[PDB]
Coordinates of C-alpha atoms in Angstrom, one line a residue:
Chain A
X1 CA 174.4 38.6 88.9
X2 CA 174.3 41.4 91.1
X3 CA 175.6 45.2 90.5
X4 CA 179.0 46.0 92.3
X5 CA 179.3 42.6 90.8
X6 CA 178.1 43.5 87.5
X7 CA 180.7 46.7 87.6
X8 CA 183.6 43.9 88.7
X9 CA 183.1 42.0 85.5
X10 CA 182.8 44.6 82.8
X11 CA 186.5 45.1 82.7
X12 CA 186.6 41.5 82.5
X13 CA 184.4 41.6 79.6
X14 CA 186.7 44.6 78.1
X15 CA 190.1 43.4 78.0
X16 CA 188.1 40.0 76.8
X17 CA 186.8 41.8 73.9
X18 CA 190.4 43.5 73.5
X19 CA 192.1 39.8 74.0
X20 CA 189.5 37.9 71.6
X21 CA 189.1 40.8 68.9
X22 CA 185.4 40.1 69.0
X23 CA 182.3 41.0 70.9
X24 CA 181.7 39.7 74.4
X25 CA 178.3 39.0 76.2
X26 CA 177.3 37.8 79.6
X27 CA 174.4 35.9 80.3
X28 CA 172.0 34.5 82.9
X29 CA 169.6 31.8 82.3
X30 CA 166.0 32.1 82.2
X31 CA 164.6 29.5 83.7
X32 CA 161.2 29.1 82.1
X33 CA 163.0 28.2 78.2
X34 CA 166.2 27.8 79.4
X35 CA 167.1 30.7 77.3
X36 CA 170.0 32.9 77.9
X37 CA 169.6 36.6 78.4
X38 CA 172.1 38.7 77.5
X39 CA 172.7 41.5 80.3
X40 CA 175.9 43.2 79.6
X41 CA 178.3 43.2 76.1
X42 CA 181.3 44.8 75.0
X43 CA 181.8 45.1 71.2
X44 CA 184.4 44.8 69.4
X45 CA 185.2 47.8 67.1
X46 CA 184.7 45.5 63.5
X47 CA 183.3 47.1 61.0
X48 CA 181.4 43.0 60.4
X49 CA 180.5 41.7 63.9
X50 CA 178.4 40.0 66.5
X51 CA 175.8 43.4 67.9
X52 CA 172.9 41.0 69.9
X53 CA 171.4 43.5 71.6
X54 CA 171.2 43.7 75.6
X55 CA 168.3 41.8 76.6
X56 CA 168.4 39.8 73.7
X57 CA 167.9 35.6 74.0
X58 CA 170.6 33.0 73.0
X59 CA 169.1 29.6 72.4
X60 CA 168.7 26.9 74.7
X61 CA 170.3 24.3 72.2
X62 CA 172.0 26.5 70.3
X63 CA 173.9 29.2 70.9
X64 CA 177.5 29.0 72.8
X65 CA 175.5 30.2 76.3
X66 CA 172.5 28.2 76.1
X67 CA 175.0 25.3 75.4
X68 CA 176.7 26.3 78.3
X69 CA 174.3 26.1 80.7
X70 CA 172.7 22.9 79.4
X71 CA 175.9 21.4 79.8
X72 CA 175.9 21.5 83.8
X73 CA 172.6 19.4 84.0
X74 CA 172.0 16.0 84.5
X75 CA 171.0 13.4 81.6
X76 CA 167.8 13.7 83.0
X77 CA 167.1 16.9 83.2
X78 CA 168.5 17.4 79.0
X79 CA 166.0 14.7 78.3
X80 CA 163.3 16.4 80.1
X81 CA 163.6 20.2 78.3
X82 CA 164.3 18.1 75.1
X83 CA 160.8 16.9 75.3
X84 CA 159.5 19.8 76.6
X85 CA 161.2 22.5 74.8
X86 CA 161.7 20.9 70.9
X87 CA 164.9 21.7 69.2
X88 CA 164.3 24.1 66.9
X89 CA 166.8 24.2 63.5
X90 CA 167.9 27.6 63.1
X91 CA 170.3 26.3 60.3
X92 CA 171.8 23.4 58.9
X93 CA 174.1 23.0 61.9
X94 CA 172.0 23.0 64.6
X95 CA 171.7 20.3 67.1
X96 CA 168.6 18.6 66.6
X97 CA 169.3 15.4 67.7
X98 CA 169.4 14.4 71.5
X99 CA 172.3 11.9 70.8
X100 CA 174.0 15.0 69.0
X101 CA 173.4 17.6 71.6
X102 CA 173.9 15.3 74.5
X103 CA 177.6 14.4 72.9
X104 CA 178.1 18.0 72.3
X105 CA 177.3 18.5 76.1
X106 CA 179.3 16.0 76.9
X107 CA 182.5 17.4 75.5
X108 CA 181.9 20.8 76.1
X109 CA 182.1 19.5 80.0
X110 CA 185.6 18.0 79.2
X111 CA 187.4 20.8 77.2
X112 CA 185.5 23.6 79.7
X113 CA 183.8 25.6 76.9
X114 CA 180.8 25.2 75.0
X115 CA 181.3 25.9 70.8
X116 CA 178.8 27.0 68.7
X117 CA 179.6 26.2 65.5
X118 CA 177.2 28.4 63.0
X119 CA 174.2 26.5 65.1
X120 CA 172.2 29.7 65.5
X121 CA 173.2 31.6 62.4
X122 CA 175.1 30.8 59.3
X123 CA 178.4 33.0 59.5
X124 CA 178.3 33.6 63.6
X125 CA 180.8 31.1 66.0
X126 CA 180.7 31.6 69.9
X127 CA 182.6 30.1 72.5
X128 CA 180.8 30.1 76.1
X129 CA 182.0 29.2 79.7
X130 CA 179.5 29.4 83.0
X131 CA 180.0 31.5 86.0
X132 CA 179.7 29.4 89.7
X133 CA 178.1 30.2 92.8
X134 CA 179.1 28.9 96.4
X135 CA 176.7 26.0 95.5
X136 CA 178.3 25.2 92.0
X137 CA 175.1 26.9 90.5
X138 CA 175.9 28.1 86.8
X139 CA 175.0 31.7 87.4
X140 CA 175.6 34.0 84.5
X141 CA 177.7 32.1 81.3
X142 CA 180.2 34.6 79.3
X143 CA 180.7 34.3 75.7
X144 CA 182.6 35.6 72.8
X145 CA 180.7 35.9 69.7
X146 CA 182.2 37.1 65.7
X147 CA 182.4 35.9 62.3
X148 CA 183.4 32.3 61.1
X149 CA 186.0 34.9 59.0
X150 CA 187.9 35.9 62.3
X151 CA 186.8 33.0 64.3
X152 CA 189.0 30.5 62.2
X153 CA 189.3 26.3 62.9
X154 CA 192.9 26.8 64.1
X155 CA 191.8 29.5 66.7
X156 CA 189.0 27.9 68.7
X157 CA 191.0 25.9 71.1
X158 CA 193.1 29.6 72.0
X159 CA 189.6 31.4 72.3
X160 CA 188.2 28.4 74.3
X161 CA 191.0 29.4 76.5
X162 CA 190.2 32.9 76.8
X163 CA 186.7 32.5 77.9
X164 CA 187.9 30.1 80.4
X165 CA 189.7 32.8 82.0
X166 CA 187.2 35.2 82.1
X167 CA 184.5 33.1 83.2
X168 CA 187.1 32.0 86.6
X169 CA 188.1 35.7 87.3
X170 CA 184.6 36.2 87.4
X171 CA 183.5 33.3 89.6
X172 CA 186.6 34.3 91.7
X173 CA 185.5 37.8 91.9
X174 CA 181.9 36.4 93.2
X175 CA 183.4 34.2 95.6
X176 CA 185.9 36.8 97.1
X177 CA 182.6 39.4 97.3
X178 CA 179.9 36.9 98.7
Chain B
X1 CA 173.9 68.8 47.1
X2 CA 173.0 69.0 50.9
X3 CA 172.0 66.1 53.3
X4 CA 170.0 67.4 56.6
X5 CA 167.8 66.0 59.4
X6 CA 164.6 66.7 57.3
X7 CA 166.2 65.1 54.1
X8 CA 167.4 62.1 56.0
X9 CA 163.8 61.7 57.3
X10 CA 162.0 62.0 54.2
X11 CA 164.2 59.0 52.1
X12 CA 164.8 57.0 55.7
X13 CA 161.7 54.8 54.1
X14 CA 163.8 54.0 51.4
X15 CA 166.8 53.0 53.4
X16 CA 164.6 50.8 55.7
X17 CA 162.7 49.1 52.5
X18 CA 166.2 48.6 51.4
X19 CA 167.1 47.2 54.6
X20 CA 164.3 45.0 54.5
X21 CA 164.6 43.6 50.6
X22 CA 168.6 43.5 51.2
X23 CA 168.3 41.6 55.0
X24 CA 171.6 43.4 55.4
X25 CA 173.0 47.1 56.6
X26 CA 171.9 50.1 54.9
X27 CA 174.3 52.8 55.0
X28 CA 174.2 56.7 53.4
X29 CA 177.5 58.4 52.8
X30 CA 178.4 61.7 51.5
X31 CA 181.4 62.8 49.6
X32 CA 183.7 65.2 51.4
X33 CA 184.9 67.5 48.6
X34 CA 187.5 69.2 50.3
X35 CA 189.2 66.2 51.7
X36 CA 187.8 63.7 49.6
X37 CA 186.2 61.0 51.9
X38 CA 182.9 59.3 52.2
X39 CA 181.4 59.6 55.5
X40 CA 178.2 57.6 57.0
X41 CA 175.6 60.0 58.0
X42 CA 172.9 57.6 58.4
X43 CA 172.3 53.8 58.6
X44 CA 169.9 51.1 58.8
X45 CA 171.2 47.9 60.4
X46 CA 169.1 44.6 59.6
X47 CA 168.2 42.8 62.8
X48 CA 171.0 39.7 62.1
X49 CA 173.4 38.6 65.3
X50 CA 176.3 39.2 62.5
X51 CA 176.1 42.2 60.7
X52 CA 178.0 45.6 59.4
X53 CA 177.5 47.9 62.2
X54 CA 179.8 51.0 61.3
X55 CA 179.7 54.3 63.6
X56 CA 177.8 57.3 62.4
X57 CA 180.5 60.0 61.1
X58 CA 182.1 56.4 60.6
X59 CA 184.7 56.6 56.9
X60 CA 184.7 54.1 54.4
X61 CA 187.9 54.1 52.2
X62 CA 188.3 55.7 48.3
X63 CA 189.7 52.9 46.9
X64 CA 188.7 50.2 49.0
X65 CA 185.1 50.2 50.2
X66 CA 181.6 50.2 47.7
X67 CA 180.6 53.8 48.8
X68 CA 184.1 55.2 48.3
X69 CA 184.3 53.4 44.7
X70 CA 181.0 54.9 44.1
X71 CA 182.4 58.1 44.4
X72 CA 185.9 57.4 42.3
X73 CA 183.6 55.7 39.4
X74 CA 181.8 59.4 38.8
X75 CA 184.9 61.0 38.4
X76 CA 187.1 61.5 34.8
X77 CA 189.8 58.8 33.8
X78 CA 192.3 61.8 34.1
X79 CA 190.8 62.7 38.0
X80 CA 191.4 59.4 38.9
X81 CA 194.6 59.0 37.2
X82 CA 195.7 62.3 38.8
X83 CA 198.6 58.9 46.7
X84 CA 199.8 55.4 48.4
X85 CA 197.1 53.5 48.5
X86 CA 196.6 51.5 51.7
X87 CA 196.0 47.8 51.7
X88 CA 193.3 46.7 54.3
X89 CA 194.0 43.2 53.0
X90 CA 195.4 40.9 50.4
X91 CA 191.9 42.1 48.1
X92 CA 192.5 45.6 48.7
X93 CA 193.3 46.8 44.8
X94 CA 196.6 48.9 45.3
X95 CA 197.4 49.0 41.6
X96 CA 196.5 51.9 40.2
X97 CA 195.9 49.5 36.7
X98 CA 194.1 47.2 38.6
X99 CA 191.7 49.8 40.4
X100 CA 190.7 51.4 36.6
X101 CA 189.5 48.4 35.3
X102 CA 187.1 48.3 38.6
X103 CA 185.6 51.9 38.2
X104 CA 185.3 50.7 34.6
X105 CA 183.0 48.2 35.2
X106 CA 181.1 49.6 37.8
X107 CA 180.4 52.7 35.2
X108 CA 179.1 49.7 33.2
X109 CA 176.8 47.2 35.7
X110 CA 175.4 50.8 37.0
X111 CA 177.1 50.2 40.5
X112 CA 179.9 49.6 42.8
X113 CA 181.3 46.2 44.7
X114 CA 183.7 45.9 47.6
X115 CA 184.7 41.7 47.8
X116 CA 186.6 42.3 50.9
X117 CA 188.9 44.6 50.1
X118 CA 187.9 46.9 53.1
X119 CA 187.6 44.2 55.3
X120 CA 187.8 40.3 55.3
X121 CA 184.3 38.5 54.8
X122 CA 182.6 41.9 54.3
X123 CA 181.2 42.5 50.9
X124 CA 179.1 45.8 50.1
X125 CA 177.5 47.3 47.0
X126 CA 176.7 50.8 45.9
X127 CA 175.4 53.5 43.6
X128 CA 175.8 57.5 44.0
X129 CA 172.9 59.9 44.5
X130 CA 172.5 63.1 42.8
X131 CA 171.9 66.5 43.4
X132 CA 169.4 68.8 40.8
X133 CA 172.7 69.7 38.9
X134 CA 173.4 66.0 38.2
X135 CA 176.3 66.3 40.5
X136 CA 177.1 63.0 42.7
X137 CA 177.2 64.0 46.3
X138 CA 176.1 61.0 48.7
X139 CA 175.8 57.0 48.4
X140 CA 174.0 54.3 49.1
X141 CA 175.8 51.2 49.9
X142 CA 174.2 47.5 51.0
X143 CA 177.0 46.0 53.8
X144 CA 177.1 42.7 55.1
X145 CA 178.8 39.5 55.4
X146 CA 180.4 37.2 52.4
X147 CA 177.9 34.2 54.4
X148 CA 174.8 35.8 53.2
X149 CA 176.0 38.3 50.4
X150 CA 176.8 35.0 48.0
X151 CA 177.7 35.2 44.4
X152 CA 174.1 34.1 43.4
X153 CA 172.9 37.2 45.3
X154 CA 175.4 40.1 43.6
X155 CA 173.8 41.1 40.6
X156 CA 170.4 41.3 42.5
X157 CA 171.8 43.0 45.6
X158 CA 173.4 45.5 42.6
X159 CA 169.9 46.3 40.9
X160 CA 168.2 46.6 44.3
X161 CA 171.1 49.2 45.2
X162 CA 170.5 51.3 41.9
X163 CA 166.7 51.3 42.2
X164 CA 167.6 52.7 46.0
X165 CA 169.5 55.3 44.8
X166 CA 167.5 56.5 41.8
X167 CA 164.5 57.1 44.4
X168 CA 166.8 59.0 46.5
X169 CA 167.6 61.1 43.5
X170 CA 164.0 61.5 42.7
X171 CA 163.4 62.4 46.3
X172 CA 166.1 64.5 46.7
X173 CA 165.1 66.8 43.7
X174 CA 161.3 67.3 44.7
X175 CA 162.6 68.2 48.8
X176 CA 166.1 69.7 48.1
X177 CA 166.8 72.2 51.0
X178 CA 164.1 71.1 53.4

């Protein structure tokens, strides 16, 4: 993430949040925890909704852009920040088993988004996709973050979808600038 | 009665304590009497990802929000009966019947309680503030998502709202037109 860049993806981010209904946050990794930081947001205009402030830290394990991330290492590399970093249970949903997390990873490779699913707080959904340099880096991850309420079963595949999209205009937009 | 800066600063510890005991959205409205509306002129949010997060100057419906019944629950059986009601969704009580039988009870429990009607998965409770005439002029309202605002937590979110508002009162009388 850079700054012309950063002004190329914030109308990405807006008509997201206009598309979704719901707040949308980009993210780059920090690479101590594996963390995501949140460095830009649009926000829906919900009276109820997801307002993680800028600078604020998604979960490695569990949140939709710490899951992400994790998803583009290797085996090895999960199994090394498991045992380093713990898996700490926010809630009831959260991943806290390898076999779990490492499935989770697994499919969110196949169906190109990652889902959190009320893992970092009871109520909150997010669907994640990460942003590619010219060395298929994950660089920044976008997400789209609201209420269980809004974010219903039957909707997740269509807002997968969406963060696809603006995850590739982004990565396109990099790629185009480099 | 008359909400400025100074006012707003001395109860603020209230709100915040509120905010605190609640771990949801504290909001202050006041009653416009000329076009009779309650606007948010202050706000505490809790620190949750998901949370109420209305706009300052923000208005929370008559009929259809826990400030707004608040404010209809002060008023006389014949000022209420005394003009389309709009329905924010299928909880929204558009039957003039129906909406009665709500500002009766909330005369009773000693506060008001919005399941939704304003705005799927969003609950919020309230009780009015008084002015040294008795008069009911502003409210204080607890806003936040049905996930945490659970029905074992109603009556006590309820009492906590009418203790709030009776120390605003108190306040208000001892600092009125500071």
């Amino acid at each position: 993430m850079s700054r012309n860049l950063l002004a190329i993806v914030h109308p990405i981010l807006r008509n997201l949040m206009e598309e979704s209904g719901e707040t949308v946050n980009m993210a780059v990794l920090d690479q101590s925890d594996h963390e995501a930081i949140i460095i830009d947001q649009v926000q829906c205009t919900h009276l109820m909704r997801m307002s993680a402030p800028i600078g604020g830290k998604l979960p490695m394990h569990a949140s939709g852009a710490g899951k992400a991330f994790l998803a583009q290492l290797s085996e090895e590399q999960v199994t090394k920040l498991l045992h380093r970093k713990g898996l700490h249970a926010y809630t009831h949903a959260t991943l806290v088993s390898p076999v779990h997390l490492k499935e989770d990873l697994a499919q969110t490779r196949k169906r190109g988004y990652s889902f959190d699913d009320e893992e970092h707080a009871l109520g909150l959904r997010c669907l994640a996709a990460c942003i590619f340099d010219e060395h298929r880096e994950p660089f920044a991850a976008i997400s789209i973050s609201g209420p269980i309420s809004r974010i219903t079963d039957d909707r997740v595949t269509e807002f997968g979808a969406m963060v696809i999209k603006a995850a590739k205009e982004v990565t396109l937009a990099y790629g185009g600038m480099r």
